[PDB]
Design an enzyme around this catalytic site. Sequence first.
Site, short mmCIF file in Angstrom:
data_model
loop_
_atom_site.label_atom_id
_atom_site.label_comp_id
_atom_site.label_asym_id
_atom_site.label_seq_id
_atom_site.Cartn_x
_atom_site.Cartn_y
_atom_site.Cartn_z
N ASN A 53 -81.47 -9.30 -59.10
CA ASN A 53 -80.67 -10.49 -58.95
C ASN A 53 -80.88 -11.13 -57.59
OD1 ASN A 53 -78.11 -10.35 -56.98
ND2 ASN A 53 -78.68 -8.26 -57.64
N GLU A 238 -72.49 -5.03 -43.85
CA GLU A 238 -73.81 -5.38 -44.34
C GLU A 238 -74.18 -6.86 -44.11
OE1 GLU A 238 -74.72 -4.00 -48.28
OE2 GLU A 238 -76.06 -5.68 -48.74
N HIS A 321 -81.17 -2.22 -52.30
CA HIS A 321 -80.54 -3.28 -53.08
C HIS A 321 -81.12 -3.27 -54.51
CE1 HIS A 321 -80.77 -7.48 -54.70
NE2 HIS A 321 -79.59 -7.65 -54.14
MG LIG Z 1 -76.22 -7.42 -49.97
#
Ligand SMILES: [Mg+2]
Lengths: 390, 390
Positions: A53, A238, A321
């Site tokens: 994504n 993050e 990720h």
């Molecule tokens: Mg992120």
Amino acid sequence: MRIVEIREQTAGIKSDIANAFIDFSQMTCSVVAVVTDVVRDGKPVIGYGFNSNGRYAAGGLLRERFIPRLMSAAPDSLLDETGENLDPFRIWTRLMTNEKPGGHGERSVAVGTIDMAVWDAVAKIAGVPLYRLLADRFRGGVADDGVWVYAAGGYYYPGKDVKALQDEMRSYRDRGYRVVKMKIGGAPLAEDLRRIDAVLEVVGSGDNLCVDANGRFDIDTAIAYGEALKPYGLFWYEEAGDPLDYALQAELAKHYDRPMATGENLFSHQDARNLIRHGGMRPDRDWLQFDCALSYGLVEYLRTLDMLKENGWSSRRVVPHGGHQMSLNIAAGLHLGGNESYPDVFKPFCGFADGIAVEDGRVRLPDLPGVGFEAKSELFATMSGLLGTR
Amino acid sequence: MRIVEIREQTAGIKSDIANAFIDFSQMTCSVVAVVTDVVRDGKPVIGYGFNSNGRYAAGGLLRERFIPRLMSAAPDSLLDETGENLDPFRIWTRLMTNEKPGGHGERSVAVGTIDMAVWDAVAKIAGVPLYRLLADRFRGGVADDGVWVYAAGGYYYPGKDVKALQDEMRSYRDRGYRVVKMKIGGAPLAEDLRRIDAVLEVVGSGDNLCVDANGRFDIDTAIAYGEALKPYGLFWYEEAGDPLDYALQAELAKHYDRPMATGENLFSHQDARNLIRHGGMRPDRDWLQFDCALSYGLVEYLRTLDMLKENGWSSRRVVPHGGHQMSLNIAAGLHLGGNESYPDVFKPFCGFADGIAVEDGRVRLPDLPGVGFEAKSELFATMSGLLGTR
Ligand SMILES: [Mg+2]
Ligand SMILES: [Cl-]
Ligand SMILES: [Cl-]
Ligand SMILES: [Cl-]
Ligand SMILES: [Cl-]
Ligand SMILES: [Cl-]
Ligand SMILES: [Cl-]
Ligand SMILES: [Mg+2]
């Protein structure tokens, strides 16, 4: 044996969820099939891939440059030294012929998606799960028994309030995840702190909560959020600032002494190396989030991992990720720190194998050939439908 | 007034020329028309754009992401404060809505190409050459009388030898260029030195010769070529190493005190800024080669120029890659150091206005509305044909 053909199609993963930088109302991804002429269990071996994504599909690149370039190669030139399996490295070199350096975006996603399908096929031809192939070839046969995973969500959404956010996070905890991640930076600071407060009522310690600013903050805002976040003792903070603004992260580290994470939006070993050289990331406490599906694939990821070792970083600091099984296999096979998981968002391009539960933040991998797509009923049906491989 | 439609098509600029990194056998570029409903001189104002050689076309991106975004916007939202011209800044913001940070490649080309067409249209609606629009809006009405230009070629080609390379460079000098550029790094060192010797017999002083390694060298090779190049006193040594390996360039500068140039393969202000911070480039002697057509366009280029000022660099150190009239207008209007030119390669996507000669390395700009495409008979015929506006 050979690659007979490579197919691509575009899938929609659209919704009105939003982070601090974008909403997902137009979001798409590529799916790819690498069709071989190898027979396993009565049917042809087909490798599958899709991209994570956030970056959209890369179908134009796939159809215009990369698939034709790879399919015009002599078929024997794509095989390994035994002549009886594909060679992802020769395939990568062919894919990247006549590509200029720099510019690591979009084409990185096309190549990452083909690479995923290639490794899926290689493991299927070898008859083993991908983590096993990788452990045997690169880690002396030692694989992790399981992988640390956390549940990522906590997006902004129209009408979504703290009660809904709590219900979301409780549902992740009920599904076996201990640590969860939420978005910040898409609302005023006080509203984000109230959201954090609400989630902590569910998950307890700050040790169980990550926050993600999605690269939206300038240095002053990044530091201000940092100061406000300190008392919560969060597992990590993050992508505070622009993923490429290495000096900004280095300045932020002077003000925020708790763990930080970044790197999902760096798509080459060159860009990863610049983060390591210039970003003030701290090998004993920070986290790296490179995603092979967006970054020219596992062949490129191995260069990134080599670079990390040469620069004094452990692979155990890497938590990709993307929430995908490709990363899950890399984590156990090459010894990463864990993998992101999406229990709710981007369906069906999320989750791991059906019927294998996450248990207090750890998940095992199925003893099934390949990446494991066939072990996810919904995802596999969607992919084979789109690619015409039923 | 409004943008009525935006069209795109892919053009071929294929040939077997090669530099140290790639050959051009499959090279393409995008062409774009931004069709407005404004009438100037009895016809619709249509803005035109194309992207520079080397990065390929971005038709998929244009059709699937970027054109639909603009075309779904409220038409009034794309206009400037007067309501009678387009606003490239509002257009850029709309184009980049829902795009995540990092990943500056390919989409940078799509946006750069639309931006070129947008500025062409804006200048046409205002009735002036683009350099004049830019000087008036950004430089208090002060424009350069002309622009410094050098002739870039010297590619490797099958059967091409030093006699043919000499003939090539002679033809550039006969067309008014003083300084020429050639490729290095695609042959053994001794063979490249013989090529350099041959070209210096034509152009005389090293002051008249640039060499370009196209990012191919590791540090040892970059240093070794540097040592061999020193006695020639070359005008610049371009892109020795990987465009993103800033530490390599910084180390090279310790070994090579003469001018160096890089940056054609950096496609955002963020990436340009990282070169400035971490690459050891020297503001007094080195050269920056950022190309707006590959880098999200002039709207983004203005951010890069602002960054240069803040970091102690003059715009006069910027000499864009790409050989195009868009850069030519930026150079005169915003006060760059010059522009690359291609007298032979990438036809018809090369050269400046017909009938305006280069004179000892300087060329003037035509007092004609827009970027100047219509002043190039062959290029305009090709583009208008491809875009269905002929
Ligand atoms: Mg992120
Ligand atoms: Cl966010
Ligand atoms: Cl990132
Ligand atoms: Cl967990
Ligand atoms: Cl070269
Ligand atoms: Cl191109
Ligand atoms: Cl010149
Ligand atoms: Mg160059």
